[PDB]
Amino acid sequence: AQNPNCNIMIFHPTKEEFNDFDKYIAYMESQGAHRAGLAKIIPPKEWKARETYDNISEILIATPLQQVASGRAGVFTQYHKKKKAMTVGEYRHLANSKKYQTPPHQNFEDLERKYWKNRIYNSPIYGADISGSLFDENTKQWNLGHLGTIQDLLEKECGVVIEGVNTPYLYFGMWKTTFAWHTEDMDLYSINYLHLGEPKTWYVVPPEHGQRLERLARELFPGSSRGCGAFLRHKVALISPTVLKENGIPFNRITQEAGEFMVTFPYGYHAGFNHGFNCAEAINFATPRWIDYGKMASQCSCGEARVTFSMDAFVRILQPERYDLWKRGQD
Ligand SMILES: O=C(O)CNC(=O)C(=O)O
Ligand SMILES: [Mg+2]
Ligand code: NI
Ligand SMILES: [Zn+2]
C-alpha cells in the first residue's frame, strides 16, 4: 500500500503532465496521495493562471463575514456576522490596517503559534464564497472554471442525467480568517488555487481516520452534537493541533503559498487559516472513486447546513432513503 503513514505529498508535474487533469489526479492516487486527505501541486514553471492581478480591485464582496469566536483558545466555534458590501480594493486596505494586519513574526511556525494563542480575541473579516473566477480564459491547463462537471461525472459513471451546475468560488482573506473543520458537500474532492498574497495554513485528518475526529468533536461540542448528528456540516468548529495531539487524533499540516494548488480528497477533514491579505479560488470535483464516498456521506437535516441547488440531485440519486429527511432540512 502506497503512503501508509498518510503523509501529505507534494507534486511537481511537468508541462506535459499538466495537460490532462483527470489523469494526473489518478496518478497522484496511484502514489497514495489521497491517504493524507490533502496534497499540494506546484505547477510547472511555464504555467500561469493569468497575466497580472493589477486589475481586481473593483470585484465586489457583497457580504463580507466577520468571524466571531466563542470558547477557549484551542476549542472554539465561530459565527459569521454579515457586514456591509465592499470592493476588493477596500477590503485589501482594511486587511492592511493596524487593527487587522499580520503581526511581526519570525517564520511560519511562530505565526502559527500566535494564531492559536490569540485567534479568539479578534474578529477578522472574510470575503468568502463569491461566485466567479480569476483564471484567464486562455489558460488551458488546471483552469478551475473549465473542469469536467460533477453532474457529467455522475452521468458517465451511473448513466443518470441530472440537473445542476458546478462553478468556482473566490475567497478574499486576511490575517486570522479561519476555515472550520469540515469535509466537502457529499464528501466530494476540492481543489484550491492561491492566486495572490499571503499564505494559507492547512490541517487535515486522513480519510481512514475521519471518524476519530468526529468522535472527539462530539465530546468537545456536546450541545451541538445533541442538536445534529452531522454538526461538522455547519462549518463552525475549531480544534487546535495541540488539542488534537492531546487526544491522539492523527493529522498533518502544511502551508500553501501563492501560485500553488491544494487538492482535498473525499472524506478528508480539513481546517486552516490565512496569514494575511490573500485571494484563493476553489471548486468541488468528482472522479470515479468518489461515487462510493458520495453514497455514504453524512448529512445534516437539522436545517443549519443549507447548501446549493445542485446537491439535491446528488442526495436524490445516491441516497434515496435519506432524501425526504434531508430535503425537509433544506425547507
Ligand atoms: O480557503 C478556504 O477558506 C476554505 N477552502 C476549502 O475548504 C477548500 O478549498 O476545500
Ligand atoms: Mg476589478
Ligand atoms: Ni474545503
Ligand atoms: Zn445540522
Swiss-Prot record:
<feature type="domain" description="JmjN">
    <location>
        <begin position="8"/>
        <end position="50"/>
    </location>
</feature>
<feature type="modified residue" description="PolyADP-ribosyl glutamic acid">
    <location>
        <position position="17"/>
    </location>
</feature>
<dbReference type="GO" id="GO:0032452">
    <property type="term" value="F:histone demethylase activity"/>
</dbReference>
<dbReference type="GO" id="GO:0010468">
    <property type="term" value="P:regulation of gene expression"/>
</dbReference>
<dbReference type="GO" id="GO:0000724">
    <property type="term" value="P:double-strand break repair via homologous recombination"/>
</dbReference>
<dbReference type="GO" id="GO:0005721">
    <property type="term" value="C:pericentric heterochromatin"/>
</dbReference>
<dbReference type="GO" id="GO:0005634">
    <property type="term" value="C:nucleus"/>
</dbReference>
<dbReference type="GO" id="GO:2001034">
    <property type="term" value="P:positive regulation of double-strand break repair via nonhomologous end joining"/>
</dbReference>
<dbReference type="GO" id="GO:0140684">
    <property type="term" value="F:histone H3K9me2/H3K9me3 demethylase activity"/>
</dbReference>
<keyword id="KW-0560">Oxidoreductase</keyword>
<keyword id="KW-0156">Chromatin regulator</keyword>
<dbReference type="GO" id="GO:0001932">
    <property type="term" value="P:regulation of protein phosphorylation"/>
</dbReference>
<feature type="modified residue" description="PolyADP-ribosyl glutamic acid">
    <location>
        <position position="16"/>
    </location>
</feature>
<feature type="binding site">
    <location>
        <position position="200"/>
    </location>
    <ligand>
        <name>2-oxoglutarate</name>
    </ligand>
</feature>
<dbReference type="GO" id="GO:0005654">
    <property type="term" value="C:nucleoplasm"/>
</dbReference>
<keyword id="KW-0805">Transcription regulation</keyword>
<dbReference type="GO" id="GO:0035563">
    <property type="term" value="P:positive regulation of chromatin binding"/>
</dbReference>
<keyword id="KW-0479">Metal-binding</keyword>
<keyword id="KW-0539">Nucleus</keyword>
<dbReference type="GO" id="GO:0006954">
    <property type="term" value="P:inflammatory response"/>
</dbReference>
<dbReference type="GO" id="GO:0006338">
    <property type="term" value="P:chromatin remodeling"/>
</dbReference>
<feature type="binding site">
    <location>
        <position position="302"/>
    </location>
    <ligand>
        <name>Zn(2+)</name>
    </ligand>
</feature>
<keyword id="KW-0804">Transcription</keyword>
<keyword id="KW-0862">Zinc</keyword>
<feature type="binding site">
    <location>
        <position position="126"/>
    </location>
    <ligand>
        <name>2-oxoglutarate</name>
    </ligand>
</feature>
<comment type="similarity">
    <text>Belongs to the JHDM3 histone demethylase family.</text>
</comment>
<feature type="binding site">
    <location>
        <position position="235"/>
    </location>
    <ligand>
        <name>2-oxoglutarate</name>
    </ligand>
</feature>
<feature type="domain" description="JmjC">
    <location>
        <begin position="136"/>
        <end position="302"/>
    </location>
</feature>
<keyword id="KW-0832">Ubl conjugation</keyword>
<keyword id="KW-0408">Iron</keyword>
<feature type="binding site">
    <location>
        <position position="184"/>
    </location>
    <ligand>
        <name>Fe cation</name>
    </ligand>
</feature>
<dbReference type="GO" id="GO:0072562">
    <property type="term" value="C:blood microparticle"/>
</dbReference>
<feature type="binding site">
    <location>
        <position position="182"/>
    </location>
    <ligand>
        <name>Fe cation</name>
    </ligand>
</feature>
<dbReference type="GO" id="GO:0071479">
    <property type="term" value="P:cellular response to ionizing radiation"/>
</dbReference>
<feature type="binding site">
    <location>
        <position position="192"/>
    </location>
    <ligand>
        <name>2-oxoglutarate</name>
    </ligand>
</feature>
<feature type="binding site">
    <location>
        <position position="228"/>
    </location>
    <ligand>
        <name>Zn(2+)</name>
    </ligand>
</feature>
<comment type="function">
    <text>Histone demethylase that specifically demethylates 'Lys-9' of histone H3, thereby playing a central role in histone code. Does not demethylate histone H3 'Lys-4', H3 'Lys-27', H3 'Lys-36' nor H4 'Lys-20'. Demethylates both di- and trimethylated H3 'Lys-9' residue, while it has no activity on monomethylated residues. Demethylation of Lys residue generates formaldehyde and succinate.</text>
</comment>
<dbReference type="GO" id="GO:0031490">
    <property type="term" value="F:chromatin DNA binding"/>
</dbReference>
<dbReference type="GO" id="GO:0032454">
    <property type="term" value="F:histone H3K9 demethylase activity"/>
</dbReference>
<feature type="binding site">
    <location>
        <position position="270"/>
    </location>
    <ligand>
        <name>Fe cation</name>
    </ligand>
</feature>
<dbReference type="GO" id="GO:0000785">
    <property type="term" value="C:chromatin"/>
</dbReference>
<dbReference type="GO" id="GO:0003684">
    <property type="term" value="F:damaged DNA binding"/>
</dbReference>
